Design a protein around this ligand. Structure first.
Ligand SMILES: OC[C@H]1O[C@@H](O)[C@H](O)[C@@H](O)[C@H]1O
Ligand SMILES: OC[C@H]1O[C@@H](O)[C@H](O)[C@@H](O)[C@H]1O
Ligand SMILES: OC[C@H]1O[C@H](O)[C@H](O)[C@@H](O)[C@H]1O
Ligand SMILES: OC[C@H]1O[C@H](O)[C@H](O)[C@@H](O)[C@H]1O
Ligand SMILES: [Cl-]
Ligand SMILES: [Cl-]
Lengths: 508, 510
């Protein structure tokens, strides 16, 4: 089933995939495939336009813009809709309320009320008790606020064994107790992959909770398959849980619940689950597609309020934290944070965290100190802020101070962040809003280096080198919160900036 | 493929190729054995030997069939038929050995012979842990059994390719080994060439390019440019696997094994897997060797660790490796395989042969049949090596236990004889455990597989069925039963009254 949609004059379209937001508004020649592909992050079968139009299907589709016409090919069925208000916000609001209504619930508020810290970039695969405790002590000693600490990949003996590796964690319970005492909560990285020659693999094969190999047979049914699917991913080759099988859910809950009971773990970073891992010669118990495997992995987080996901299909309006994917240590990537985060919010992902300050791609790790500072300042007034590489280790004293000052500004602004976070639970309305969302039809369709925190604060993080920053103000009066200088709105201004400037304006 | 087609001589009998097929020999009309990519679950050698002193050899694998009275061999490389002028099986063995697999002059570690061996596999299976291993070792001593080599079998480590004790089940592995040593045991660890394919060890091995690579079914793709590992399905799951053709894989394996010896005091290693079948398919090796040669090269690692054991093997006849018969079922059929498999093993160059595990070595079996366990123990006793796994004191009542202990005592009594011939096998390759045909050619012993000779002078006829009567075919000469002292004239078959305790054994006195 297909659909051709001529653009309205001036109309701009966004949607489909968080990790394609930098390519939007959709341009002539643009192509996005959702079927079997979440583009390395979150994806939703939704398009929204600046004229209040929207496209939804319950199922994946592909979209191409050819000239001034959208061509959409649906695997199921879909339709074009118009909201009568005629703005992006109206499209968002009607599509949300029809197709991904707000659940009424928040993720664990500890994820918002302090910065987050992830051991990934600092320790990589050498996750061990001594170094994790040291990183935590270091956070405290450098005057950073204790928050949620995420112990990343490889704290366990092998994939599918949900226990601390005793060689590197002689007393994990003691470690967690010490971390709690210091004011941290703790999350563990978990995934649905199973090292496919181990005790856990054989148990899961016997329980029939893995995805099976179809052998490329047309006819072979799940109930008769004998061999597991083996999937290649970034860590190697593994068996994988079948998210359509209720018994897989039971198994996963037993594992996670056990870590909570035994060690006091507060929550889980849900890794992987990307649709692409479910393609090919694979048999699932309930015969669902690859996208819905990803979606059902996402549902696990509904049982653990302290959660985070990178890969997602649907689950808009839900109490899941949605992280932007691994960012490179580049200026190009720091300029993705805002448009990616703002799109995430329109797709129903209000609780968006922008990856890791300074970069989340471990291979990157000559570091650029200025970039790290600008990355930190851009995180600060986003819904959540996440560190990994240790600022005190990689920065000199005044770059470090500027990071501390970013954290201080987040602290000053937290009541506002939390007001809109709490409201997002109820209404689904994003915390971080695009300029277009708040100020429709005022020339902001392509302004992606500015965002609104709620309705009243305009944030314009410095996202390049240079001592000059341009800021497009909507009509109205705007007071810069640090300088206190009031600006007449309805023009673009030039601001002299230093390493420490985070331009932010209150609507008056 | 090049080939031979050999009319059998009158009365001629042929053995060879594969240890785990010996029960089907002498090769009968309709027989077929493929060696290419196939070691039949144990040791295999490209050798055939005949009762008329003839032999066939190739450096490389072949297939053999018998159709009527024609023995046909199809070679992957080249081969030939030979005749030893003395005209007996022993002459064929001796000439083939000296030409194609001469004795190295070396022995495996003598502690493997000078006491019974004990393997934790059947008692503990996948639950290998410090407490239970120490308990098993204490139970050996408390029940009056001698300390020997203790083999800690599969799953003492976190995952395949991580050569360290799992600290969850082994809180002080060095102290455990220290304890076991002071109780008079030596300790071997199960190791294999498989790597859990999403782990740190796997990624390290991939980065060092020591794994076997995936050819993608391409004919042109060269090792040098391959990027993905071969994944292999085996009894424990799916794994990457070391490329035994790659000298860097040897280095890596030595680093692991030397590390375990230095850090924990481990005495040797049970070398698992390596079966040729694991190396078939879309696979690229650094030096472009076949599947059988991958099995052979795994076997060579044991040349660096005198305390070793292998199940899978290709060639390496005449070498200081313990060759274990494969996992035996808890059946009477399988206890009856021990002798013909062990004797063939000797003819193929595997003198240091151990007959799997007393009472069975297939963990799925584990109605235990106590009498079967006893007869298994008694059959092991005068073989080159004797290996327990399932705990006799746990599964046997008091008479039966005592009969196992008596078997151990007979082995102790006979050990000087065992060792005399074991030390000689190192030098000449002559088997310790010899077939009746080997020692007594052309006397009607071609199909007698329930008797063997310990060296030249001791005829052992273990009881291998239920009942109170045992038939024993004595070669010409005089034979003294070692318990009774009664002397029997040979050239006939006698019937002996037997009990659960009886281990019929005769000394040659003429
Ligand atoms: O897609 C998720 C993956 O992204 C890769 O680019 C990164 O190297 C991995 O560590 C993993 O996080
Ligand atoms: O071929 C070796 C294998 O043999 C199987 O029969 C057995 O169940 C396994 O435990 C393993 O020893
Ligand atoms: O392998 C670990 C790595 O996997 C991927 C995630 O996006 C990263 O944040 C990190 O967790
Ligand atoms: O998996 C363990 C199992 O593997 C096979 C061996 O032949 C057995 O003796 C035992 O070691
Ligand atoms: Cl990947
Ligand atoms: Cl197998």
């Amino acid at each position: 089933q297909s659909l051709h949609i001529p653009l309205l004059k001036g109309e701009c379209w966004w949607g489909a995939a968080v990790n394609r937001a930098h390519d939007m508004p959709l341009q002539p020649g643009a192509f996005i495939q959702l079927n079997g592909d979440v583009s390395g992050n979150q994806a939703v079968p939704l398009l929204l336009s600046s004229a209040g139009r929207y496209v939804w299907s319950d199922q994946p589709f592909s979209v191409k813009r050819e000239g001034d016409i959208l061509s959409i090919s649906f695997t199921g069925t879909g339709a074009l809709y118009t909201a009568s208000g005629g703005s992006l916000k109206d499209a968002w609001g009607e599509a949300a309320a029809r197709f991904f209504p707000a659940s009424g619930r928040l993720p664990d508020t500890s994820l918002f009320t302090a910065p987050q810290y992830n051991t990934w970039i600092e320790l990589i695969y050498n996750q061990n008790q001594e170094d994790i405790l040291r990183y935590a002590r270091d956070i405290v000693a450098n005057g950073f606020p204790p928050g949620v600490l995420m112990i990343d990949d490889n704290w366990f003996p092998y994939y599918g064994n949900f226990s601390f590796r005793k060689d590197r964690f002689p007393d994990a319970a003691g470690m967690i107790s010490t971390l709690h005492g210091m004011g941290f909560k703790v999350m563990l990285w978990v995934c649905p992959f199973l090292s496919p020659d181990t005790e856990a693999f054989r148990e899961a094969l016997a329980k029939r909770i893995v995805l099976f190999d179809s052998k490329g047979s047309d006819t072979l049914q799940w109930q008769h398959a004998v061999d597991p699917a083996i999937v290649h991913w970034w860590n190697g080759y593994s068996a994988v849980l079948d998210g359509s099988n209720p018994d897989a859910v039971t198994w996963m809950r037993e594992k996670l619940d056990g870590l909570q009971q035994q060690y006091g773990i507060d929550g889980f970073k849900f890794a992987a689950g990307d649709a692409e891992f479910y393609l090919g010669n694979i048999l699932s118990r309930e015969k669902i597609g690859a996208n819905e495997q990803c979606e059902r992995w996402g549902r696990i987080g509904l049982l653990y309020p302290m959660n985070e996901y990178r890969a997602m299909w649907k689950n808009g309006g839900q109490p899941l934290v949605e992280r932007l994917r691994d960012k490179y240590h580049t200026w190009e990537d720091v300029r993705k944070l805002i448009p990616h985060a703002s799109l995430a919010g329109l797709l129903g992902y209000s609780f968006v965290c922008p990856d890791m300050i300074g970069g989340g791609d471990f291979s990157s790790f000559k570091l650029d100190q200025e970039l790290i500072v600008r990355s930190a300042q851009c995180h600060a007034l986003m819904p959540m802020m996440q560190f990994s590489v240790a600022p005190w280790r990689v920065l000199d004293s005044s770059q470090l101070q500027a990071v501390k000052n970013a954290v201080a500004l987040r602290r000053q602004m937290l009541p506002e962040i939390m007001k809109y976070t709490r409201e997002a639970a109820v209404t689904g309305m994003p915390v971080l809003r695009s300029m277009e969302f708040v100020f429709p039809h005022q020339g902001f369709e392509r302004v992606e280096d500015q965002f609104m925190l709620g309705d009243n604060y305009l944030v314009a993080p410095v996202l390049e080198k240079g001592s000059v920053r341009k800021i497009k103000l909507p009509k109205g009066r705007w007071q810069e919160i640090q300088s206190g200088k009031v600006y007449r709105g309805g023009e673009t201004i030039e601001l002299k900036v230093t390493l420490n400037t985070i331009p932010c304006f209150k609507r008056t």
